[PDB]
């Protein structure tokens, strides 16, 4: 159930396992736990050592170079909550340089309330990618898990699937398991943070992590808000006071803690706002008999004496030592060598201070985007200045954009000069505004505020260029902006045009194809766009190119990013035209839409034409041998320096000349396709070739504006009995026993018939064949037999067309006279 036994305040264990045996009788650690620096240790020194009683840790857990430890599943088999009240360099779980460690094994870790997890330099640690930290820690983007065995090698991670839950991480579902035999317990979304039981039932509203029986505060394992009498409560009822943000205590316990410090060497506890806090905040003073903080009859701030008069803020834990401070009796150095935005936890610890007796220095703060976390910073006395007599030292801040919101924020620097160098995203406008507000305008000397490094990567030209004449064509865009001239019009070396296609409106500022535009002659400067793609929206804005000025402000002018879309036109040719004739009169034609729509495609045009049969087939003798009828580079850097130098040299010569000279004396079938890519075609002749003309056309009513077609050919299937001969077989016998055979031709064949074959066989004799071609059939009106032996024959006739061979006609019997 809840926490039994002792409380074992924060402890550190080193150099052996001898002193760790004092964690046996306590379940919750009221502080931080550190197991580190164990070299004379062996893997057999941890099997018999286990701490099932430990449940929750308040500050953090640190593990640094403990040899022989392979898994935490035995040391802490029931650790479930790390509150993270006090972090170790903005981290709540640090595992650093754990040699011989192979798996985490913290299979009960459910919630990490505050902080992050860092795992680094563990050459044998695996089962790291199989942990869903999003279910454990809220802000998972701040975790730093690098240089392990999960990426250096390919160590296997076997989560039993025949039960470990699978959750999506990036784009795939993977099973979650701490070890080879323990699955990461995942609760349903109905149990937000209170946890679930074995059967998946939500615990009490005041619960956290795990519980024995659902919907019962007294059967939980880790309290979400506070602990009291084995029960989790939202707030401490009277006469109990909050203590360490995790449990409720009476006045006697806090008094004993206070007296144990007063009568000894410390955190002399007091009472304020129904809490037993270490030090009373600003504006209150502890009394003699009672410990409750009465408000003072005077504005007494909380001074925080910084040792050595210089404090470096580099993490959440360093800033937290200034929590509740109002006046700082020292100097602050803000250096977050990071990559994750800590302003959320920085404004909670800082931002309550008003005065700084020394200097404020912000150096190499990569992650900071603004100094707005100083909510109440008003006075910088500068009684102790940075070397070189500086009271505000900003340097090498790669993402600093805003110093303060000067509309409502007041600032007053008493002494010391300013310094701003290598702030690529902090512009001179903010610096000068802060100079005016602070009152140190006439205090800085040259090169204290840099010019080629402050804001060199930020667009703050603070002057608007207005486009004056824009119109678009097929593949060109015409641009015209109002002319711009600095006071020295020769300083304008020309304009620079940035363009980029954008499907949607909101586009970033500052790809980005560049073209250099000369200044006009003193006619708007303008420029003509070329090499565009039709029906595409582009982002356009112009940024001036002025010569640098070391003395005064350099200069600035730029235009808002306008969006222009070029017009539509005829699309491309439809792709992949394929035609298939599944039936004797039906053809299915399939195609792909053109790759260049150049607008919205509205309709398609398909044309057909029956191909006339080749003339030579009607005038070829195919009974002869040989009768095989077919069965149908950015501008390099030194270069631009050359134009810069030449343009400056021309002005230098002009100025020298002017100074010297002047002395101041004293029809075919078709159809319309609607949003379809195929068609079934009716009314087609059987076994005939067709020519298809296919177009994709995006405009019908206001005249068609569309391109050339795609051509393809297809042949329909033939009929069954098209080639078969119909009609009775008619024969004539002359005086000289000449047999003249006649038969009705197949009026409607599959295209055309090339030849006929007649098979006459006298009874008992062998079959005789004779080919009759088109010309023979026309000349003889069928067949003519000369010189035949007496007897009775059997005559069968077949017709051969383009489709193939037709069926033979019924046998016919004729008898020639014997004489």
């Amino acid at each position: 159930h809840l926490y039994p036994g002792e409380v074992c305040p924060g402890m550190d264990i080193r150099n052996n396992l001898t002193r760790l045996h004092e964690l046996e009788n306590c379940s919750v650690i009221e502080g931080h736990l550190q197991i580190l620096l164990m070299f004379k240790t062996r893997p057999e020194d941890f099997r018999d050592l286990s701490f099932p009683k430990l449940i929750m840790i308040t500050d953090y857990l640190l593990l640094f170079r403990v040899y022989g430890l392979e898994s935490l599943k035995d040391l802490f088999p029931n650790l479930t909550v790390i509150r993270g009240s006090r972090l170790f360099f903005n981290y709540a779980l640090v595992i650093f340089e754990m040699v011989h460690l192979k798996e985490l094994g913290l299979y009960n870790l459910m919630n990490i309330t505050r902080g992050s997890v860092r795992i680094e330099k563990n050459n044998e640690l695996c089962y790291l990618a199989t942990i869903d930290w999003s279910r454990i820690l809220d802000s998972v983007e701040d975790n730093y898990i690098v240089l392990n065995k999960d990426d250096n090698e390919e160590c296997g991670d076997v989560c039993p699937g025949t039960n470990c839950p699978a959750t999506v991480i990036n784009g795939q579902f993977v099973e979650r398991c701490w070890t080879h035999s323990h699955c990461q317990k995942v609760c349903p979304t109905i149990c937000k943070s209170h946890g679930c039981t074995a059967e998946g039932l939500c615990c009490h509203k005041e619960c956290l992590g795990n519980c024995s029986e659902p919907d019962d505060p007294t059967k939980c394992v880790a309290c979400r808000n506070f602990y009291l009498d084995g029960q989790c409560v939202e707030t401490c009822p009277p006469p109990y006071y909050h203590f360490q943000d995790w449990r409720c205590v009476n006045f006697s316990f806090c008094q004993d803690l206070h007296f144990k410090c007063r009568n000894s060497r410390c955190h002399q506890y007091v009472i304020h706002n129904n809490k037993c806090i270490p030090e009373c905040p600003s504006g209150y003073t502890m009394n003699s008999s009672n410990l409750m903080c009465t408000p003072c009859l005077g504005p007494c701030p909380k001074v925080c004496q910084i040792l050595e008069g210089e404090k470096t803020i580099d993490s959440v834990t360093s800033a937290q030592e200034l929590r509740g401070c109002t006046v700082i009796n020292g100097s602050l150095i803000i250096n977050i060598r990071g990559g994750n935005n800590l302003a959320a936890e920085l404004e909670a610890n800082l931002g309550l201070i008003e005065e700084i007796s020394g200097f404020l220095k912000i150096r190499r703060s990569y992650a900071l985007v603004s100094l707005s976390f100083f909510r109440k910073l008003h006075l910088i006395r500068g009684e102790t200045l940075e070397i070189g007599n500086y009271s505000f030292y900003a340097l090498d801040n790669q993402n600093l954009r805003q110093l303060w919101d000067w509309s409502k924020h007041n600032l007053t620097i008493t002494q010391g000069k300013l310094f701003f160098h290598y702030n690529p995203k902090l512009c001179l406008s903010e610096i000068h505004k802060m100079e005016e507000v602070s009152g140190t305008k006439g205090r800085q000397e040259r090169n204290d505020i840099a010019l080629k490094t402050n804001g060199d990567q930020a667009s703050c030209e603070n002057e608007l260029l207005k486009f004056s004449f824009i119109r678009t064509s097929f593949d060109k865009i015409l641009l015209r902006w109002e002319p711009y001239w600095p006071p020295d019009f020769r300083d304008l070396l020309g304009f620079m045009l940035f363009y980029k296609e954008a499907p949607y409106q909101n586009v970033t500022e500052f790809s980005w194809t560049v073209v250099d535009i000369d200044p006009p002659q003193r006619s708007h400067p303008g420029w003509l766009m070329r090499g565009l793609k039709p029906w595409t929206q582009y982002a356009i804005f112009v940024k001036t190119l002025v010569t640098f000025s070391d003395e005064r402000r350099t200069y600035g002018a730029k235009s808002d990013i306008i969006y222009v879309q070029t017009d539509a036109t005829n699309p491309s040719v439809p792709l992949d035209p394929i035609s298939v004739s599944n039936s004797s009169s039906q053809i299915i034609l399939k195609w792909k839409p053109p790759s260049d729509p150049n607008g919205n495609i509205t309709h398609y045009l398909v044309y057909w034409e029956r191909q006339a049969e080749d003339s030579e087939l009607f005038e070829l003798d195919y009974c002869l041998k040989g009768l095989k009828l077919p069965s149908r580079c950015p501008k390099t850097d030194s270069q631009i320096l050359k134009e810069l130098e030449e343009s400056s040299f021309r002005k230098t010569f002009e100025d020298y000349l002017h100074n010297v000279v002047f002395v101041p004396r004293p029809h075919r079938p078709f159809e319309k396709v609607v949003n379809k890519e195929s068609l079934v075609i009716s009314g087609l002749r059987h076994f005939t070739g067709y020519r298809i003309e296919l177009q994709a056309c995006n405009q019908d009513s206001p005249d068609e504006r569309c391109s050339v077609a795609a051509y393809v050919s297809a042949r329909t299937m033939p009929e069954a009995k098209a080639d078969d001969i119909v009609g009775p077989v008619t024969h004539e016998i002359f005086e000289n026993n000449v047999v003249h055979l006649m038969w009705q031709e197949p009026k409607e064949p599959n295209g055309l018939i090339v030849l006929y074959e007649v098979s006459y066989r006298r009874y008992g004799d062998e079959e005789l064949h004779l080919c009759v071609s088109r010309k023979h059939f026309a000349l003889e009106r069928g067949c003519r037999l000369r010189g035949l032996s007496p007897g009775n024959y059997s005559v069968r006739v077949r017709a051969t067309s383009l489709a193939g061979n037709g069926s033979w006609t019924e046998p016919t019997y004729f008898y020639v006279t014997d004489y």
């Binding site: 119109r471 064509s473 097929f474 060109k476 015409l478 003509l528 070329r530 090499g531």
Partner: peptide
């Protein structure tokens, strides 16, 4: 893409720049 203008490209470019006042070519 981004290259010199020759022929029809030139005539469309000149029609773009001028034509309200008139160009002879």
């Amino acid at each position: 893409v981004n290259q010199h203008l020759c022929g029809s490209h030139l005539v469309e470019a000149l029609y773009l720049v001028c034509g309200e006042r008139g160009f002879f070519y």
